[PDB]
RNA sequence: GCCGGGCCACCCCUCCCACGGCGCGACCGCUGGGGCGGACUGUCCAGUGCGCCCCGGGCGGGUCGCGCCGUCGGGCCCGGG
């Protein structure tokens, strides 16, 4: 059979609904305000 | 000294181009709010970007058009009396 029909036929391309499965990289302001929130929370607990 | 032409000087009108200034309009990026979908953060319920739409405003520069101002401006110092 291989010697008879050796050609390869590609699988047809399929439509995509464009769903991301990973996590996008966090942004500069996002991480800066995360650090700010952490500092505020720690100081709040220290006062409390 | 012998007869004509043209030009700039009078006085007035009008074209184009160049330069500088002022004001208006069209296209741009950057920046404060609202609506939507979601993703994330914080040892108080609070907050942060993201993609779309609405954007009411600001910013100046790059180009274009418009109007005015100024030039012992340039067009044989355009042309008309």
UniProtKB/Swiss-Prot annotation:
The gene is RPL5. Component of the ribosome, a large ribonucleoprotein complex responsible for the synthesis of proteins in the cell. The small ribosomal subunit (SSU) binds messenger RNAs (mRNAs) and translates the encoded message by selecting cognate aminoacyl-transfer RNA (tRNA) molecules. The large subunit (LSU) contains the ribosomal catalytic site termed the peptidyl transferase center (PTC), which catalyzes the formation of peptide bonds, thereby polymerizing the amino acids delivered by tRNAs into a polypeptide chain. It comes from Oryctolagus cuniculus. Residues 13-23 have a biased composition (Basic residues). The modification Phosphoserine is found at residue 27. The chain holds residues 246 to 293 of 297 of the full protein. This is Large ribosomal subunit protein uL18. Residues 8-48 are annotated as: Disordered. Component of the large ribosomal subunit (LSU). Part of the 5S RNP complex, which is a LSU subcomplex composed of the 5S RNA, RPL5 and RPL11. Component of a hexameric 5S RNP precursor complex, composed of 5S RNA, RRS1, RPF2/BXDC1, RPL5, RPL11 and HEATR3; this complex acts as a precursor for ribosome assembly. Interacts with isoform 1 of NVL in an ATP-dependent manner. Interacts with RRP1B. Interacts with IPO5, IPO7 and KPNB1; these interactions may be involved in RPL5 nuclear import for the assembly of ribosomal subunits. It is found in: Cytoplasm; Nucleus, Nucleolus. It comes from the Eukaryota. Belongs to the universal ribosomal protein uL18 family.
């Amino acid at each position: 059979a291989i010697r008879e029909n050796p050609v390869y036929e590609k699988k047809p391309k399929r439509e995509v609904k464009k769903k991301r499965w990973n996590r996008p990289k966090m942004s500069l302001a996002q991480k800066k305000d995360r650090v700010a929130q952490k500092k505020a929370s720690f100081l709040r607990a220290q006062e409390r």
